[PDB]
Design a protein around this ligand. Structure first.
Ligand SMILES: C[N+](C)(C)CCO
Ligand SMILES: C[N+](C)(C)CCO
Ligand SMILES: C[N+](C)(C)CCO
Ligand SMILES: C[N+](C)(C)CCO
Ligand SMILES: C[N+](C)(C)CCO
Ligand SMILES: C[N+](C)(C)CCO
Ligand SMILES: C[N+](C)(C)CCO
Length: 432
């Protein structure tokens, strides 16, 4: 007489009565609908373990995004949401937490789910929480207590998946990058010779670095050769990243430090320890210079860097025995929105601007600091290189010449020295 039909939002059942608070299957649509207590079909909402989409159709074998929970959900073959379980969907593995929330950007035991919720396979993962590298294998599990060949190089993963670095594993040494050593490594006052396949061949004891010879002191690089003379100076650079230094006199005497380069901060921001560092060095009469890490992008930025530098110098009553350093590197913001110009000409302009501003303000003991590879590429210009007298190269020898600068200079040869009176690694240079 009038059965099994939709009357707007209402549904008339097999008999001839209105549906109410019940599931009905429509044969035309081949779909389930849940009819609410109001008599109307539910839509854009959950009912128990099931989701009713726009138009009322129960979701089955499909993803649903719920704006209320800001979460993806997956609805199984019977409509029930996936929860506390793994599902293979479109040839990828997904994990669903309690209440059906898709896991994303997190671990689930030995597996890691990316931002789209997919289990990672054959990929590197840095995890800040564990502050280390992991490698998720073909099966999705993190590599552990085993070797892995990745991108043509060999890596060792320890218990809990940690990538070994700067450490031994049997006859093999994992370098700073984590990759197996295949040639030579100088460390612990020794030279180590590895076969091309990685196993240690030979160990030779060396006496290198700062060596004390009968009342005198010299610096020897890793190729057992002298840098500078007996008057070579040990210069550290310090920043908030070294934490707070409570006993500066201890630091200076016990490590035989001749001077310090102190971080001012970076473009627009003052180093947290600058005030304390300047105060202490001033009071103790330790020779120091300073450096600003630049995030410049143009001449406006370069002028702002100099202005900031000048303000800080007068503010803290800085007494500068060593230069003011423009720390020039391949910078990038943490959110990666901006990164340094690549072209030589833009940096000629930036560096020239900074120098010119400093000069007109009365500061002429101003120089550029950078690392070797950059001075060889995007910085290789007579107008820049004329300002360079402090070069980083964490190598066995500097092996870099600068025709455009003559006189006293520094080589930052390490970022991993330990020193009495300081916690953690310290940057150290030889001045010569
Ligand atoms: C329930 N539908 C929305 C599918 C049609 C009936 O109004
Ligand atoms: C009617 N249920 C929704 C409970 C079963 C789905 O097929
Ligand atoms: C992710 N897998 C389903 C492959 C294993 C988890 O138990
Ligand atoms: C799937 N949720 C758990 C979010 C809704 C239950 O009705
Ligand atoms: C729908 N997700 C993005 C959650 C995974 C499937 O692509
Ligand atoms: C790889 N870790 C074991 C450190 C993370 C939890 O699975
Ligand atoms: C193995 N990676 C090169 C990705 C990490 C270096 O620390």
């Amino acid at each position: 007489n009038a059965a099994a039909y939709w009357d707007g939002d209402y549904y008339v059942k097999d008999d001839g009565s209105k549906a109410q608070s019940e599931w009905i299957f429509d044969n035309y649509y081949k779909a389930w609908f849940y009819i609410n207590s109001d008599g109307r079909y539910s839509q854009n909402e959950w009912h128990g373990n099931y989701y009713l989409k726009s138009g009322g159709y129960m979701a089955q074998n499909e993803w649903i995004y719920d704006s209320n929970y800001k979460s993806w959900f997956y609805l199984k073959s019977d409509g029930a949401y996936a929860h506390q379980e793994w599902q293979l969907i479109g040839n990828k593995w997904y994990y669903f937490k309690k209440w059906g929330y898709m896991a994303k950007s997190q671990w689930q035991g030995s597996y890691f789910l990316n931002g789209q919720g997919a289990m990672i396979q054959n990929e590197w993962l840095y995890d800040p929480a564990y502050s280390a590298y992991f490698y998720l294998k073909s099966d999705g599990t993190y590599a552990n207590q085993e070797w892995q060949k990745v991108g043509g190089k060999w890596y060792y993963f320890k218990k809990w998946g940690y990538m070994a670095r700067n450490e031994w594993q049997g006859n093999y040494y994992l370098t700073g990058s984590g990759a197996m050593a295949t040639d030579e490594v100088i460390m612990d006052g020794a030279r180590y010779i590895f076969a091309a396949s990685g196993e240690l061949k030979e160990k030779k004891d060396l006496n290198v670095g700062w060596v004390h010879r009968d009342g005198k002191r010299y610096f020897f690089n890793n190729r057992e050769e002298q840098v500078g003379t007996e008057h070579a100076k040990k210069i550290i650079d310090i920043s908030e990243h070294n934490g707070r230094i409570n006993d500066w006199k201890k630091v200076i005497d016990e490590n035989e430090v001749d001077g310090v380069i102190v971080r001012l901060g970076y473009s627009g921001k003052e180093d947290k320890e600058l005030a304390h560092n300047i105060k202490e060095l001033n009071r103790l009469g330790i020779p120091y210079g300073v450096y600003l890490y630049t995030y410049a992008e143009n001449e406006t930025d370069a002028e702002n860097d100099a202005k900031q530098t000048i303000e800080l110098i007068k503010k803290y009553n800085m007494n500068l025995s060593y230069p003011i350093y423009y720390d020039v590197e391949n910078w990038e913001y943490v959110n990666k929105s901006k990164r340094a110009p690549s072209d030589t000409d833009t940096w000629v302009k930036i560096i020239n601007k900074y120098m010119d501003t400093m000069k007109q303000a009365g500061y002429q003991n101003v120089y550029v600091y950078s690392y070797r590879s950059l001075l060889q590429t995007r910085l290789k210009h007579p107008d820049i290189l004329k300002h360079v007298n402090w070069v980083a190269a964490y190598t066995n020898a500097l092996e870099w010449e600068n025709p455009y600068y003559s006189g006293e200079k520094g080589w930052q040869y390490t970022s991993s020295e330990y020193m009495k009176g300081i916690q953690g690694r310290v940057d150290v240079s030889v001045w010569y």
